[PDB]
Design a protein around this ligand. Structure first.
Ligand SMILES: *[C@@H]1O[C@H](CO)[C@@H](O)[C@H](O)[C@H]1NC(C)=O
Lengths: 49, 49, 49, 49, 49
C-alpha cells in the first residue's frame, strides 16, 4: 500500500487474498477428516465401556 | 505509392531468411506493436508463410 | 540513488527496459531483470543535431 | 559507429536524451529521504508509527 | 518461453501453475476419503477373522 497506488494496490493484494483463502480452506478440509477418524474411535471406546 | 484502404494489397513472403532487425532502418516508426508474439524473439522462430 | 544519463536514437528508447534485447540493450547498456527505478526520456533535436 | 543526428530526420530517428534513476528498497540505514517532519516519541501506548 | 518475453512469461506460466496445483490437490483430497473407506472394511475383516 505504501509503494503502489490504489489502482495497482487492489491488483497486488488481490493475489494475496486468494492465496490466503486457499491456504485456510485446506486446514478445515483436513480437520473435517481427522474429526471423523476420532469419532470412530470414540464410538468404539463407548461400546467397549 | 501505397494502395487505398478499400483496395489494400497483400504480398506473400516465403522461402527466404527473414531478419526483422533491418526494418527499423527502413521507416521512422516508433511503436511496432505486436499481439501474438513478443518482438524481441521474432528472429528465433520459424514460420510457414 | 544512482543517476545515469546518455543520448540515444528514438527507435531504441523502447529497448531501455528489463528483459529487452537489441542493438543497444546487448553491447551498450543492459538493465537488470529485476530493476526497481524510473526511466525518463525526452526529445532533444533542437540542441543535439 | 557514430550517429548522424540532423534536422532532416523525422520522429524515431531524432536524438533522445535519457536519464535513469535507480533506487533500492531494502532494510539498511537510510541516508536520502523525502521531505517529512518528525514528531516526538511516545511509548507504552497504542499509536501509529 | 520461446515466444514471449519474461515480463509476460512470468504472467503466462503463473496461470498454469495455479491450475495444475488445483488439479493436484483434488487427487489427494479424494484419496484421503477412499483411504478411510478402505480402513473401515479392513477393521471389519479383522473383527470377522
Ligand atoms: C528507398 O528506395 C530508394 C530508391 O531505391 C532509395 O534511394 C532509398 O535510399 C531507400 N530508402 C531506404 C530507407 O531504404
Amino acid at each position: 500500500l505504501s509503494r503502489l497506488d490504489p489502482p495497482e494496490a487492489e491488483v497486488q493484494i488481490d493475489r494475496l487474498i486468494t492465496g490466503r483463502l486457499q491456504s485456510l480452506q485446506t486446514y478445515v478440509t483436513q480437520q473435517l477428516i481427522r474429526a471423523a477418524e476420532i469419532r470412530a474411535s470414540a464410538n468404539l471406546a463407548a461400546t467397549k465401556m | 505509392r501505397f494502395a487505398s484502404v478499400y483496395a489494400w494489397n497483400r504480398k506473400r513472403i516465403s522461402n527466404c531468411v527473414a531478419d526483422y532487425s533491418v526494418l527499423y532502418n527502413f521507416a521512422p516508426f516508433f511503436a511496432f506493436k505486436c499481439y501474438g508474439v513478443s518482438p524481441t524473439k521474432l528472429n528465433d522462430l520459424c514460420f510457414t508463410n | 540513488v544512482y543517476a545515469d544519463s546518455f543520448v540515444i536514437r528514438g527507435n531504441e528508447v523502447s529497448q531501455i527496459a528489463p528483459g529487452q534485447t537489441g542493438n543497444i540493450a546487448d553491447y551498450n547498456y543492459k538493465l537488470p531483470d529485476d530493476f526497481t527505478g524510473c526511466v525518463i526520456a525526452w526529445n532533444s533535436n533542437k540542441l543535439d543535431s | 559507429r557514430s550517429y548522424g543526428f540532423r534536422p532532416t530526420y523525422g520522429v524515431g530517428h531524432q536524438p533522445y536524451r535519457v536519464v535513469v534513476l535507480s533506487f533500492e528498497l531494502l532494510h539498511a540505514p537510510a541516508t536520502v529521504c523525502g521531505p517529512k517532519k518528525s514528531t516526538n516519541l511516545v511509548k507504552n501506548k497504542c499509536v501509529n508509527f
